[PDB]
Amino acid sequence: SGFRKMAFPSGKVEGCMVQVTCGTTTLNGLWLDDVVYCPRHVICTSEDMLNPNYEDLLIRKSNHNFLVQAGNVQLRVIGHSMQNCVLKLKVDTANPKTPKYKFVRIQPGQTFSVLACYNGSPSGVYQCAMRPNFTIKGSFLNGSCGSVGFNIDYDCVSFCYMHHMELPTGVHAGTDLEGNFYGPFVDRQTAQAAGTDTTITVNVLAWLYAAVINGDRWFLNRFTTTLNDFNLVAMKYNYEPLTQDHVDILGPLSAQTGIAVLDMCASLKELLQNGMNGRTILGSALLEDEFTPFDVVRQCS
Amino acid sequence: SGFRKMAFPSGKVEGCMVQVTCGTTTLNGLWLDDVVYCPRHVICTSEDMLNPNYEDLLIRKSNHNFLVQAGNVQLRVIGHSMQNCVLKLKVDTANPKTPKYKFVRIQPGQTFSVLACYNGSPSGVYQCAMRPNFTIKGSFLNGSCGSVGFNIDYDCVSFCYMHHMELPTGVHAGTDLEGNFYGPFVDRQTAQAAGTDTTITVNVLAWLYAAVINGDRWFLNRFTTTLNDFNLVAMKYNYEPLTQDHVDILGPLSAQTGIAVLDMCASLKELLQNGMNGRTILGSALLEDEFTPFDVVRQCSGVTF
Ligand SMILES: *CCC(=O)N(C(=O)[C@@H]1CCOc2ccc(Cl)cc21)c1cncc2ccccc12
Ligand SMILES: *CCC(=O)N(C(=O)[C@@H]1CCOc2ccc(Cl)cc21)c1cncc2ccccc12
Ligand SMILES: [Ca+2]
Ligand SMILES: [Cl-]
Ligand SMILES: [Cl-]
Ligand SMILES: [Cl-]
Ligand SMILES: [Cl-]
Ligand SMILES: [Cl-]
């Protein structure tokens, strides 16, 4: 019993964290096989960041301009190339601690663990969700750039995020491991703002099912709703629309607890209407949206 | 910016997790040097748990009755002894991945990371606090016994907890790595209940400082309180007393934000007698007490391991 926000064991990722230096800029890199991946803005000065021409800045660099440090061992850079917003530094040594891995691009609502690093040294691990506005509500200071988000579903590390920047509201923006940003963001100091952040409805429903599995039933009601009526209400609370795909995703949890998805949708409608009235659901006074249907089945069952 | 419940990197501990089997019972073990540590109830059947005589159960077991498995390699048990509620299995191979470590017993209110394992395989890491009633609000299923709690001090892993059991309310009980339980619990299938819990006051204050560092300042007020007046109010709301030691420990955060500890206590006093009034602090509608003053400083300054 118990329901906690849990991150994946970070060991497989810690063995990949290296320090990358280019001139005066120092950030984190992901050393997999003989390649170190890091944000391409490592080649920029603060006076280049407004309108950087990365192709132009990179062509002026040689391998000896990149200092890669794995622990106390300096790695020799034998090549450098750019793929979208990620710099790929070819090194002379394959990482012996390279886990079984793949690069995955995730969708909003998906969750992942973040190993926050500074100077190639892991400092902490936390669990995150990709917000519907493509930002992550992380905990990142200056120097955390290059820290990665991942999932470890059996033996294989799926790298899904690389941290690049913090937006003026304190939220974070980054790319998949192929350097493509999540969201309408660019790696430049130009005025950028996240879209209105909404609640991940499917995740709140999943967490309400996790509450029923752990014994909590106070919020249940004898109502059902249509998918359309639910969405009209949920949208008024800044909740993401629930699609038929989301309803199908909640099927296993619906079958396990004996509560139809649209019946649980009516409980959610009521919770948004009344608040919790001094009660908690799984030790929380707010509706949690950073547990996917998959995380609920993995943690509870 | 950002404030998350963050656990220490679990890598140094993952390299120590092994599977321990005794008959039909299978749980997790901590392999450090040539010793595997695990709950002593691994020797018990479901009937033995009713009233176990662990010396009697242990004297009947030989080394080959314990199957230790490190990944896909079976470790040969060359000795077995018991220290309090922990079984120590001597093995023929020293763990090459043994980190720099020490065994520490923590005090209630102190926090640590838990590497939840099943069949010697780590499945997740989470942060938690030793509640003042000596339970941990963990996330543990059957087969999680032997999962450990730890902190990291630079390169040293301080093992502070080993999971043993779940109480009827869903909360968890375990021991330090010397087998001494945290709290008035025993390793036996019998009626046991946690005492009424309290809020870790110094940790709530630390989290209020973390909110201030992050730009959440609505709860700040012009007022201050005496340490004695604050405690009279805290006692009323099942909040742990704030000692002068706690006030000193919050000093660096008090200096960084420019808010005196007793100035922040008047905010906390108001939060108890008035609530949050529909507002949140760091995205939370409740006062968080599972971040110590050290966790706040560590997270907000970027300390690495
Ligand atoms: C690695 C630090 C860093 O670069 N951060 C930034 O957000 C940069 C600051 C200037 O603006 C900027 C524009 C584009 C890009 Cl891609 C990067 C930056 C950074 C990242 N995470 C958290 C941070 C907290 C505080 C300062 C800087 C942060
Ligand atoms: C590792 C499984 C286990 O033994 N757990 C227990 O709590 C035991 C169940 C029977 O009663 C009992 C009495 C005393 C002791 Cl020391 C242990 C037990 C176990 C541990 N954590 C979470 C669990 C969840 C569900 C079932 C069993 C759990
Ligand atoms: Ca191992
Ligand atoms: Cl681009
Ligand atoms: Cl609206
Ligand atoms: Cl909450
Ligand atoms: Cl919410
Ligand atoms: Cl108490």
DSSP result, A212-281: HHTT--TT--S----HHHHHHHHHHTTBPPPPHHHHHHTHHHHHHHT--HHHHHHHHHHHHHH--TT--B
Cβ atoms of B299 and B210 closer than 8 Å: yes
Q: What is the distance, to the nearest Å, from the Cα of residue A124 to the centroid of all Cα atoms in its chain?
A: 15
CA B233, B238, B241, B247 dihedral sign is negative
Phi, psi of A91 (to 5 degrees): -120, 160
CATH of B1-14+100-197, one of 2.40.10.10, 3.40.50.1370, 3.40.190.10, 3.30.70.3400: 2.40.10.10
Residue with the nearest Cα to atom 18 of ligand 2?
B165
Cβ atoms of A3 and A300 closer than 8 Å: yes
Q: List, in sequence order, every beta strand (DSSP E) within A71-118.
A: 73-75, 77-83, 86-91, 100-103, 111-118
Residue B161 contacts A, CB cutoff 8 Å: no
Tokens 């995730």 belong to residue: A106
Q: Taking the CB of residue A76, how many other CB atoms lie within 10 A of it?
A: 12
Tokens of B13: 């501990």
Cβ atoms of A1 and B135 closer than 8 Å: no
Cβ atoms of B13 and B157 closer than 8 Å: yes
Domain B15-99 CATH superfamily? Trypsin-like serine proteases (2.40.10.10)
Q: Taking the CB of residue B250, how many other CB atoms lie within 10 A of it?
A: 25
Ligand nearest to the CA of A179: 4
- Give the method used: X-ray
Is A139 close to B4, i.e. CB distance below 8 A?
yes
* Nearest by Cα to B284 from B179, B190, B192, B214: B214
For chain A, give every domain's residue range.
1-14+100-197, 15-99, 198-301
To which H or E segment does residue B209 belong? helix B201-213
Is A170 close to B215, i.e. CB distance below 8 A?
yes
Q: In whole angstroms, give the CA distance from residue B162 to residue B179.
A: 8
Residue with the nearest Cα to atom 2 of ligand 2?
B142
Is A11 close to B7, i.e. CB distance below 8 A?
no
Tokens of B261: 């500890």
For strand B156-166 and strand B100-103, is the pairing parallel, antiparallel, or unpaired?
Answer: parallel
Q: In whole angstroms, give the CA distance from residue A280 to residue B51.
A: 37
Alpha-carbon distances of B256 from B243, B246, B266, B291, rounded to whole Å: 21, 16, 18, 17
Active site residues per annotation of B: 41, 145
Q: Taking the CB of residue B63, how many other CB atoms lie within 10 A of it?
A: 14
Residue type, B32: L
Q: Taking the CB of residue B194, how many other CB atoms lie within 10 A of it?
A: 18
Q: Which residues, other chains included, contact A207 with Cβ-Cβ below 8 Å and sequence gap of 6+?
A: A281, A282, A287, A288, A289, A291, A296
- Chain B residues touching residue A172 (CB < 8 angstroms): 2
* DSSP state letters, B145-206: TT-EEEEEETTEEEEEEEEEEE-TTS-EEEE-TTSPBSSS--SSSS---PPPP-B-HHHHHH
Alpha-carbon radius of gyration of chain A:
21
Q: Taking the CB of residue A73, how many other CB atoms lie within 10 A of it?
A: 9
* Three-state SS letters, B246-294: HHHHCHHHHHHHCCCHHHHHHHHHHHHHHCCCCCCECCECCCCCCCCHH
- Dist. CA A113 → ligand 7 center (Å): 20
Q: What is the DSSP letter of A181?
A: B
Tokens 């649209």 belong to residue: A262
CB pairs under 8 A between A and B: 130
- Chain B residues touching residue A115 (CB < 8 angstroms): 9
For strand B66-70 and strand B148-153, is the pairing parallel, antiparallel, or unpaired?
Answer: unpaired
Is A125 close to B15, i.e. CB distance below 8 A?
no
Please check whether the two domains, A1-14+100-197 and A15-99, share a CATH topology: yes
Q: Which residues, other chains included, contact B153 with Cβ-Cβ below 8 Å and sequence gap of 6+?
A: none
Cβ atoms of B107 and B199 closer than 8 Å: no
Q: What is the distance, to the nearest Å, from the Cα of residue B296 to the centroid of all Cα atoms in its chain?
A: 17
Alpha-carbon distances of A20 from A31, A117, A240, B31, B293, rounded to whole Å: 10, 12, 38, 34, 31
Number of helices followed by number of strands (H, E) in chain B = 8, 13
Using left for φ > 0, alpha for ψ between -120 and 50, and beta otherwise, residue B289 falls in: alpha
* Nearest by Cα to B270 from B229, B303, B221, B304: B221
Residue A271 contacts B, CB cutoff 8 Å: no
- CB-CB: which of A137, A139, A214 is closest to B6? A139
Tokens of B183: 């709290």
Burial class (CB in 10 A: 0-12, 13-18, 19+), B175: buried
Strand, coil or helix: A64: helix
Instruction: Give the atom of ligand 2 at the shortest distance from the alpha carbon of B186.
Output: 16
Residue B149 contacts A, CB cutoff 8 Å: no
Burial class (CB in 10 A: 0-12, 13-18, 19+), A282: middle
Q: In whole angstroms, give the CA distance from residue B301 to residue B278.
A: 30
Beta bridge pairs of residue A112: A128
Mutate to test the pocket of ligand 2, among B86, B142, B181 (most ligand atoms within 8 A of CB): B142
CA A264, A269, A273, A275 dihedral sign is positive
* Nearest by Cα to B64 from B49, B75, B52, B53: B75
Is A5 close to B284, i.e. CB distance below 8 A?
no
Residue with the nearest Cα to atom 20 of ligand 1?
A165
Burial class (CB in 10 A: 0-12, 13-18, 19+), B278: exposed
Interface of A with B in 179-238 (CB under 8 A): 214-215
Helix then strand then coil, % of chain B, to nearest 5: 25, 30, 45
* Nearest by Cα to A240 from A200, A212, A275: A200
To which H or E segment does residue B113 belong? strand B111-118
**Lining residues, ligand 1, CB within 6 Å:** A 27, 41, 49, 140-145, 164-166, 187-189; B 1
Is A41 annotated in the active site? yes
Structure resolution in Å? Answer: 2.1
- CB-CB: which of B2, B122, B137 is closest to A138? B2
Residue A71 contacts B, CB cutoff 8 Å: no
Residue with the nearest Cα to atom 7 of ligand 1?
A165
Alpha-carbon distances of B130 from A27, A217, A219, B161, B200, rounded to whole Å: 35, 28, 29, 9, 10
Cβ atoms of B1 and A170 closer than 8 Å: yes
Tokens 């190339």 belong to residue: A81
CATH of A198-301, one of 1.10.1840.10, 3.90.1300.10, 3.90.25.10, 3.10.20.30: 1.10.1840.10
Residue B155 contacts A, CB cutoff 8 Å: no
Cβ atoms of A35 and A51 closer than 8 Å: no
Strand, coil or helix: B59: helix
Q: What is the DSSP letter of A132?
A: T
- Dist. CA B158 → ligand 1 center (Å): 33
Cβ atoms of A257 and A217 closer than 8 Å: no
Cβ atoms of A205 and A249 closer than 8 Å: no
Helix then strand then coil, % of chain A, to nearest 5: 25, 30, 45
